[PDB]
């Protein structure tokens, strides 16, 4: 029922009694206690009216406190908050401009229906005001009003004033209004944010240099949506935007790179400017790796895209993309991928050695990544595969378990890529057979035994070792063991009869998975009807295989490179995949 709720003794009653002292200093600490109570989760709605009774105050600090209270109520329960609009509207005209701005932003914070009729007059009032800070707030309030349900055909007069704001005097003003208007345009009427290209763009780029650390980002994002038409136009644009190596290292530099790489469509070698850009882009892209970790993550997920698109720029920086011991793992991974991408044939001398170092760290998963990176490197410069397999042999000889597994999984790929070029190594792999547990590695080892069976006269016992423990093993090893045992049969008959009976049977009579059963019966009929077609049907040269996955779609790349700096890049997904 209603115990513990009386207001004659206890906290709430005591605060309510305090809130009515005529010593303002005590009212201050009073409302402060109230705010703390709101935050901690204590029900203070009962205090509501008298706190509003405290709004009748000349003091700045006290009114600030009460406005913070009302803001706290705004986004949770708006109807309650509305009960002070009579003062809110009697707040947008006071002296102390801070009061004006506070009132405007707070009123905008409300999200209810009837606010518009209350708000249309003050807001439209304050856009045309002497003070900068107030206009900086009111510009935002406009977008606030737009997101709440209102097309509010006066919104056309609003937008008139808003375009009139881009021709402002103070930097932060336009620095904010441009962002407000761009956000308006995204919920998209096709007739919005028209660019008076020469005049408006000149004004934007004049205000850019005086702008605040933050608004430059929005300026650049508004330019990005612009589409030029003529060459010298783009020349002048890139010239003016050029000097960006600015302080907000993460943001301004990245968005400048966006506006550049979107405005990189000129006669390349007719003027020595294409070269000039391709030269200037490198120092900032590099210096964006010295900041904090998260900035480094974003910069790397964008530089990956850049390398995908215009590799001529970063073609000689594979040193700065090395992995340091103390980085967060989500940076090591990006550095590794970029290193693979830049792995030319000239610098392998260090690259294939650098990776040789990483395979001796302790961060296990990263070591897996490094071994497979050696692998993928051995498929992008053919003229080094021999050294690659040599380094892999070294790593195997290290006899570390969770390294030898990825090592052998990559050596399988290598052999299948360049067949019959590293066949002396095969026997040496087998001696490292006892220490293979994971399914991938077991399968790859058995597969290597599959091919090149006539290299080893010991291949029989090798697979006979797995044959006993046939269950408790994944389907992969079972199927690959089937294929391999049969391959061994056709190449060395009269000595596998002992095997191809129990292998086949243990696969088909015993196992339950009907797919292994299927392949078992398939192989059974081939090797029972005629050994003349078995060879031509199983032993054919499986053609060469290329890693067709490692590239991103070109038009998708076009899209993302139109969205460099935004959140769109860091996922490598188009903006539609999230509203």
């Amino acid at each position: 029922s209603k115990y513990f709720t009386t207001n004659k003794k206890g906290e709430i009653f005591e605060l309510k009694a305090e809130l009515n002292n005529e010593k303002k200093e005590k009212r201050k600490e009073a409302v402060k206690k109230v705010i703390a109570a709101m935050t901690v989760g204590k029900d203070v709605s009962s205090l509501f009216p008298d706190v509003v009774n405290c709004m009748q105050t000349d003091n700045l600090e006290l009114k600030k406190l009460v406005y913070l209270y009302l803001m706290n109520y705004a986004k949770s329960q708006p109807d309650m908050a509305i009960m002070a609009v009579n003062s809110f509207v009697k707040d947008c005209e006071d002296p102390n401009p801070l009061i004006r701005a506070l009132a405007v932003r707070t009123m905008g914070c409300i999200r209810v229906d009837k606010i518009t009729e209350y708000l249309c007059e003050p807001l439209r009032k304050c856009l045309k005001d002497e003070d900068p800070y107030v206009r900086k707030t009111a510009a935002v309030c406009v977008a606030k009003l737009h997101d709440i349900n209102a097309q509010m055909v006066e919104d056309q007069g609003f937008l008139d004033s808003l375009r009139d704001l881009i021709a402002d005097s103070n930097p932060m003003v336009v620095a904010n209004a441009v962002a407000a208007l761009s956000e308006i345009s995204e919920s998209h009427p096709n007739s919005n944010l028209l660019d008076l290209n020469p005049q408006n763009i000149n004004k934007l780029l004049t205000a850019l240099n005086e702008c605040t650390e933050w608004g430059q980002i929005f300026i650049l994002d508004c330019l990005s949506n612009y589409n030029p038409k003529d060459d010298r136009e783009a020349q002048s644009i890139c010239e003016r935007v050029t000097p960006r190596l600015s302080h907000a290292n993460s943001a301004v530099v990245l968005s400048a790179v966006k506006v550049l790489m979107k405005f990189l469509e000129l006669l390349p070698k007719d003027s020595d400017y294409y070269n000039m850009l391709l030269k200037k882009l490198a120092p900032p892209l590099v210096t964006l790796l010295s900041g904090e970790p998260e900035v480094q993550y974003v910069a790397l997920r964008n530089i990956n895209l850049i390398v995908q698109k215009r590799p001529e720029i970063l073609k000689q920086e594979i040193k700065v993309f090395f992995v340091k011991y103390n980085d967060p793992i989500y940076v090591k991974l990006e550095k590794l991928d970029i290193m693979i991408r830049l792995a030319s044939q000239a610098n392998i001398a260090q690259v294939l050695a650098e990776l040789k170092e990483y395979a001796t760290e302790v961060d296990v998963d990263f070591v897996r990544k490094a071994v497979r990176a050696i692998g993928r490197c051995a498929i992008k410069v053919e003229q080094s595969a021999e050294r690659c397999v040599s380094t892999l042999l070294d790593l195997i000889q290290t006899k570390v378990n969770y390294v030898v597994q990825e090592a052998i999984v990559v050596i399988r790929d290598i052999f299948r890529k360049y067949p019959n070029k590293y066949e002396s190594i095969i026997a040496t792999l087998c001696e490292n057979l006892d220490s293979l547990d994971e399914p991938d590695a077991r399968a790859a080892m058995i597969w290597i035994v599959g091919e090149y069976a006539e290299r080893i006269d010991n291949a029989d016992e090798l697979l006979e070792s797995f044959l006993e423990g046939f269950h408790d093993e994944s389907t992969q090893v079972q199927l690959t063991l089937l294929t391999a045992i049969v391959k061994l049969f056709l190449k060395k008959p009269s000595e596998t009869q002992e095997l191809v009976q129990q292998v086949l049977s243990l696969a088909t009579q015993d196992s339950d998975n009907p797919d292994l059963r299927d392949r078992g019966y398939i192989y059974w009929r081939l090797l029972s009807t005629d050994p003349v077609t078995a060879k031509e049907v199983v032993l054919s040269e499986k053609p060469l295989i290329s890693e067709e996955t490692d590239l991103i779609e070109p038009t998708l790349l076009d899209e993302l490179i139109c969205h460099i700096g935004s959140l769109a890049s860091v996922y490598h997904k188009p903006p539609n995949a999230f509203v």
Partner: protein
């Protein structure tokens, strides 16, 4: 009472920061340390107030390393407030200073020797609160003697019995089973019900290890219970809760009965049954209050009673009446009541006697299930559904379970699918029922179905087939909704690649569009799914040559023979070489009808 304490606590509550508070507390600690170490002897009042402040500080969370000396000095006083504060402090801060332990044993010995029942109350409370093995050795020899003496006041009898309980739980060896048994069990006939409360609780916890020494309690138990239940409204006025006569005493008395077999005296047994029936009947009248309190209080006794009957399990009529009441509960506002009824039906479903009674309410159960908002309630309901599924109602139960899966939220899917699979394996009266249910389950929520389940369904289709058009059409249709997920792709691909000759007749079941289905599912499925699809591909190529070209057109793609994985391309090469070349007729001797699965 003490103004200084109040101002202290107020200042504490006005601290603007944890550091300011902790500084103020260290300051007060320094002050009280000084005044205790000051050579001036102290007045009782000041010592009381100061130990109060100490206790408060300890309760806020800090540490306190002194004061217990005054705590000892405060037991020998004679003003009640001082005795209270002292015993409180000594009870809250447990410490093993052997000398102080001895002092406290001395002071409590003195108090128990006294005659004011208030002092005896405080002493017994402290003993019950701390309860060290030493206080055991110091008073467990006396406490029953305090309990059995006739002139001991009431509250003394209550608290003394409870403290004997606390002793029994802490130190069982230090309470010998002497003579007081008779009088402790005779306690029950007292008029002051509180005496009965204490005596019952104590007798329960004692009899839980020596029933044959307390068997004589059940008669008084049932007599008191009868006198309580057949009471009038204006009886036990001090001991009646919202027009309910003596709930807690009834609860504890039934609990006491729960520790014993059925009573051996026939008239006792009969009066007991009449009490239970009385409770159940009283449970059916309209309420005498719109207030939740009455409902909770009465239903407490009700649940206690039915649980007792279950512990007895000899009154079938009572059992079924209980079950019918329970079923009436299942549709109720009080989520508490709904949960509790479900919980109790869960165990009732284990009876030789109430099984069918539970079964009858199945539609109520299912309707509660189909709309309930809690997660625990739904879980319990599904578990009950499991609990009452047998040869009779399995089919309907399973059908309803699947129909719920058709929309049920994630939080239950796992155990629902597990239980439906197990029920199917258990009571499937025929193949076609079994295969139908399994396949529907897969279509609906495959990505939780075990590995062995669809192994088994494919196995059984291979054996006793006669469902091929059904299976084929089911997977066919489920595929063309854009939601079809993996295990369905697997099972259907295999089975239609085995038996598509029995679906290829529908104009909307063309071999071409069959392959188009399967290829539309290809570029989303993983590698073992792809392998299964490639085996079915060649099975088709053996049967329906009408796409023999385009299939091969796919098999030759960069995506197939340049495949990154090894086994995909292995199968691809083998099958392309089987088909395009190296035979066109021996294909019929390799891709035959998959000889039937043997019996394990």
């Amino acid at each position: 009472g003490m103004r200084g304490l109040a101002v202290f606590i107020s200042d504490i509550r006005n601290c603007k920061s944890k550091e300011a508070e902790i500084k103020r507390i260290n300051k007060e600690l320094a002050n009280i340390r000084s005044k205790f170490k000051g050579d001036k002897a102290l007045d009782g009042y000041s010592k009381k107030k100061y130990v109060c402040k100490l206790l408060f500080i300890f309760l806020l969370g800090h540490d306190i390393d002194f004061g217990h000396m005054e705590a000892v000095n405060l037991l020998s006083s004679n003003r009640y407030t001082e005795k209270q504060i002292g015993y409180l402090f000594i009870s809250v801060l447990v410490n093993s200073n052997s000398e102080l332990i001895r002092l406290i044993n001395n002071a409590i010995k003195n108090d128990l020797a006294s005659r004011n029942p208030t002092f005896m109350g405080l002493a017994l409370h402290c003993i019950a609160n701390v309860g060290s093995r030493e206080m055991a050795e110091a008073f467990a020899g006396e406490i029953p003697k305090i309990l059995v003496a006739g002139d001991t006041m009431d509250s003394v009898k209550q608290s003394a019995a409870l403290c004997l309980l606390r002793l029994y739980r802490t130190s069982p060896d230090l309470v010998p089973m002497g003579d007081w048994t008779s009088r402790v069990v005779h306690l029950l006939n007292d008029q002051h019900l509180g005496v009965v409360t204490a005596a019952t609780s104590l007798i329960t916890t004692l009899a839980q290890k020596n029933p044959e020494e307390f068997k004589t309690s059940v008669s008084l138990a049932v007599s008191r219970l009868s006198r309580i239940v057949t009471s009038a409204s204006t009886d036990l006025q001090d001991y009646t809760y919202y027009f309910v006569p003596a709930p807690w005493l009834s609860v504890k008395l039934l609990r006491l009965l729960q520790c014993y077999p059925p009573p051996e005296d026939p008239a006792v047994r009969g009066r007991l049954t009449e009490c239970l029936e009385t409770i159940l009947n009283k449970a059916q009248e309209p309420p005498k209050s719109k207030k939740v309190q009455h409902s909770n209080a009465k239903n407490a006794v009700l649940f206690e009673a039915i649980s007792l009957i279950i512990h007895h399990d000899s009154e079938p009529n009572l059992l079924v009446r209980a079950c019918n009441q329970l079923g009436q509960f299942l549709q109720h506002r009080e989520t508490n009541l709904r949960y509790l009824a479900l919980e109790s039906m869960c165990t009732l479903a284990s009876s030789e006697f109430s099984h069918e009674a539970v079964k009858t309410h199945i539609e109520t159960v299912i309707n509660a299930l189909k709309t309930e908002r809690d997660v625990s309630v739904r879980q319990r309901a599904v578990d009950l559904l499991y609990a009452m599924c047998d040869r009779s109602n399995a089919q309907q139960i399973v059908a309803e379970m699947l129909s719920y899966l058709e929309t049920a939220d994630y939080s239950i899917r796992e155990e629902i699918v597990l239980k439906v699979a197990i029920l199917a394996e258990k009571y499937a009266v025929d193949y076609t029922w079994y295969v139908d249910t399994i396949l529907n389950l897969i279509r609906i929520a495959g990505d939780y179905v075990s590995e062995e389940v669809w192994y088994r369904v494919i196995q059984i289709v291979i054996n006793r087939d006669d469902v091929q058009g059904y299976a084929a059409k089911t997977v066919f249709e489920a595929l063309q909704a854009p939601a079809c997920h993996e295990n369905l792709v697997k099972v259907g691909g295999y089975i239609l690649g085995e038996f598509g000759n029995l679906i290829a007749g529908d104009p909307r079941s063309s071999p071409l569009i069959q392959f188009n289905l399967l290829h539309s599912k290809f570029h989303l499925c993983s590698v073992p799914t792809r392998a299964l699809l490639l085996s079915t591909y060649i099975k088709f190529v053996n049967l329906f040559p009408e796409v023999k070209a385009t299939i091969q057109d796919v098999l030759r793609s960069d995506s197939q023979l340049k495949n990154a994985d090894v086994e995909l391309q292995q199968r691809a090469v083998e099958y392309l070489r089987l088909s395009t070349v190296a035979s066109t007729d021996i294909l019929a001797t390799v891709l035959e009808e998959m000889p039937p699965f043997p019996e394990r």
